[PDB]
Amino acid sequence: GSHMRGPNPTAASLEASAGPFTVRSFTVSRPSGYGAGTVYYPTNAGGTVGAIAIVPGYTARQSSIKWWGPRLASHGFVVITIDTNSTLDQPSSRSSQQMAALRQVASLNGTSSSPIYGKVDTARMGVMGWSMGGGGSLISAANNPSLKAAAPQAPWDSSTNFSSVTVPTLIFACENDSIAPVNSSALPIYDSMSRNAKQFLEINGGSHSCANSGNSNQDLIGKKGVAWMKRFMDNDTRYSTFACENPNSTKVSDFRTANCSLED
């Protein structure tokens, strides 16, 4: 089955700061199994949408990853950005907390008082996150193969072996990352995965925060993250090109993809 929402995409519509849908948000009153959460949701997507949970890195908070909330929600997703119980939580803890945030989004979907009452397809979920939050996202995907997509950025984990992962995984990497160097983190993680649709997109000259809030490549990074989630969370083959294609961009220092068909 496909779960198509919104107008036929173009490069221009995906590069724009906002997609076609009106976005609202709220703070989660009583977070269950994580520190704090903001939920971003489309008011007018024209049907139920999937949910994505986004986790920051070590010492970081929602501010680092917040730009993804409006960006993805405006294309037809419910997005929860979290703060972790402690800023010093490790990747396994960040994974548990990311899944607790998806569980609470599923709870709010059935809560007649919630602004997202009836707005979520709880069978279509994705995971994203930065550094140890990206490691967390890969752990979530390894543990929960029913997840539809993963798109970590500058991932860090003390194991690079994700060879069990069957979830379609886009790795955003930062060429000049000195915190989680591409050669010891992002690329070995990418190379470990032989069972999935996967993509490696390295931002030219990027520091470890090259995919964070306020980054100078929100056009390309936004387009790719939205296309990946559309293709794989909605099974929307109008996004096969945008999801799977080399963007052929001077802003990209390294592009690799496997098991990613251009076909509609």
Instruction: Transcribe 128-186 into DSSP letters.
Output: EEETHHHHHHHHHHHH-TT--EEEEES---S----TT--S-EEEEEETT-SSS-TTTTH
- Say if residue 156 carries a ligand binding annotation: yes
User: In this structure, what token pair is assigned to residue 60?
Assistant: 């970081």
Catalytic residues: 131, 177, 208
Contact 235, 2 (CB under 8 A): yes
Using a 10 angstrom Cβ sphere, with 0-12 exposed, 13-18 middle and 19 or more buried, the burial of residue 225 is: buried
- d(C-alpha 98, C-alpha 100), whole Å: 6
Closest CA to 57 of 145, 154, 122: 154
Q: Considering its fold, how many domains does the chain have in total? A: 1
152 forms bridges with which residues in the sheet? Answer: 129
- Say if residue 132 carries a ligand binding annotation: yes
- d(C-alpha 39, C-alpha 109), whole Å: 12
Tokens 């649709």 correspond to 197
Resolution attained, angstroms = 1.9
Structural domain boundaries enclosing 223: 1-264
Closest CA to 141 of 125, 130, 156: 125
- Say if residue 68 carries a ligand binding annotation: no
Task: Tally DSSP H helices, then E strands, for the chain.
Answer: 7, 9
Closest CA to 242 of 227, 232, 252: 227
Query: In this structure, which amino acid lies at residue 231?
Result: R
Contact 77, 49 (CB under 8 A): yes
Method used experimentally: X-ray
- d(C-alpha 73, C-alpha 25), whole Å: 10
- d(C-alpha 79, C-alpha 193), whole Å: 26
